[PDB]
Chain length 225, copies 3
Amino acid sequence: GRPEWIWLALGTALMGLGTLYFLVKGMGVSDPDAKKFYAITTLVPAIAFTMYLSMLLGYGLTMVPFGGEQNPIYWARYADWLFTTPLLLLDLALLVDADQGTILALVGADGIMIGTGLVGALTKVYSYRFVWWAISTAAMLYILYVLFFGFTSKAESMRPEVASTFKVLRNVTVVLWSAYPVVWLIGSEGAGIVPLNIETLLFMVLDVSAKVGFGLILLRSRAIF
Amino acid sequence: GRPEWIWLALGTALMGLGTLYFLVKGMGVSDPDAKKFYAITTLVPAIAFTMYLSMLLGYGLTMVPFGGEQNPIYWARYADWLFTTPLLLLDLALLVDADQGTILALVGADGIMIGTGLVGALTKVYSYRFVWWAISTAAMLYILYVLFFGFTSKAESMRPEVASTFKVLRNVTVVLWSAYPVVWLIGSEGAGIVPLNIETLLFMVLDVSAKVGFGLILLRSRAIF
Amino acid sequence: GRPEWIWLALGTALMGLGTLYFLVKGMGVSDPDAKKFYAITTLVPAIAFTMYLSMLLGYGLTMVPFGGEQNPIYWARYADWLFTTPLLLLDLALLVDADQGTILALVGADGIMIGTGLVGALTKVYSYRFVWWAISTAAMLYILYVLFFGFTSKAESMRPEVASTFKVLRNVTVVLWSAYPVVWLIGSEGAGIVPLNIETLLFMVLDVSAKVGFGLILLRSRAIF
Ligand SMILES: *C\C=C(C)/C=C/C=C(C)/C=C/C1=C(C)CCCC1(C)C
Ligand SMILES: *C\C=C(C)/C=C/C=C(C)/C=C/C1=C(C)CCCC1(C)C
Ligand SMILES: *C\C=C(C)/C=C/C=C(C)/C=C/C1=C(C)CCCC1(C)C
């Protein structure tokens, strides 16, 4: 890895600045609900920072042999999404006021979506790498389903400021989230159609949007109170 | 690994079907307690599926050198039991209505039972592999103890449908769970007395029973409401 | 690793005895709050035991090449602190009666402090190992901050036996905790100024104090009721 260094260093900067902003922002917050939202939201980019730094400094990169090649796989991406997506799922669940049962379904389904997708990236048998991608995406579909059809109805029985803020975020996650299994598939980890430099650029845009952008939408609203 | 492939492929099928059944089953459930039970219970085999698939497709298998040999160790078994046994512990705890303190003891003890048992499997010094087995089983004994003597009394102060369903499950876990440290010890991971093909068959029967069977007993009862 | 074996074997003994004491001690406890305190507190050394044993028996030791050398890094230390420090953070939070938001901040910050510090230990580029140490310590400072200025005020609105016991423990963690990034820096994992034998002795004293000592202070008080 070298050409994409710029993308990784750029993602390390943004996530870093993204954490600083939220920390400084939530400093004056007294409301225990809002205070929880800033807690969950600030932690997402903080983790993303460390994981992006590990990729830039070289750590988060590995080499997996599939096909007639040793392929550079950035695993820190999976280590990032493992703790990051569940927290993003909690923001949405606190907002909408979800059941302890549905949250456990989602966190349980999310862990499977990431780990299973990680197994795909490390799989040395090219073909197989696609089975796990299939299992990983099936689980994402299940998540975006209850997040769209379950949470929405759940947000409707709440204050309009909350109801709407959720609508924005709902669309934002459904659209962003479903980009990963598409970027992955065409990127170097799957059916190579796009080079690593681009794949890395693409994931960099989704990560910043999903982690920092989502945070802005949410934290800068009154829906968190 | 090859001869046992049939056992792994059979366990991948059952766990897979086991997840589909519970998902489709709990679909009509409205009760937030039952809905939590289906949440916890459905997730157990789902994880088991992925872990069993990883073993079949080759991933979940490693080679550990102990003795005058490089020994095939299926680690995905430990990765499975790590998230699976705590969830099974939560089903029993929700049912019986346990204290947040005892649950933390059990989950804390369970994590130690699996990780410690994993350390045993990966230990390159043959002798040592038995110390960890001893520490892993001591922790299982501690778990089956409060699960038998602590939870039972706890179930007694509840509706008889719940009290009884717990009794069934209680026996089912105490008996099933204590089979693992026995199968392990005689299997290839320990004092080789049984071949890998059998060890794998045995764990396959315990896993299906513990994950799917237990689920059936529980989900098909009214005790979950 | 060999000369320090005595330190590791001594830490394995103490942690082991430390677990036995608390188990036997909390056996008569009926109070659900105290029962939670013994639950959280007993589990800290139990984990520490297994991790210290893994280091003695050889498992928890790795070799990382940085500089003109292959350096012996005991990673089981990080695997220990990963589950151990969050639990110690929960003791303090239950005692003081903290918000679910602040606890998530602390556990989230703590995980980053350990993992980030682990990345440092495994980093093959000598220089970099210091960036992660910096990120790991920044996160510890953030933790000792709210643990000192946030929790204290929180303890003040409680029974004096609790208020005071917290004061003792507060100082004990702030002082002990800030010794690790200092021992690390001068030890073999960082700017080698002290040999492994000493580094290991030092961490052995902090671990016993933080895990067992802290437990004694806390469990032998009435503040846990
Ligand atoms: C960092 C924030 C978010 C929302 C990241 C989400 C990541 C995913 C939803 C990943 C999805 C994947 C799928 C569906 C299948 C292939 C493997 C992936 C992990 C890339
Ligand atoms: C998947 C469901 C269950 C109930 C699996 C449980 C697994 C165990 C109880 C494992 C026990 C072990 C012991 C006691 C000691 C050796 C190592 C094992 C992990 C096999
Ligand atoms: C086992 C109990 C405690 C309190 C252990 C705590 C460990 C730390 C606070 C570690 C701190 C580190 C820092 C701050 C930076 C370098 C890496 C360390 C993990 C050693």
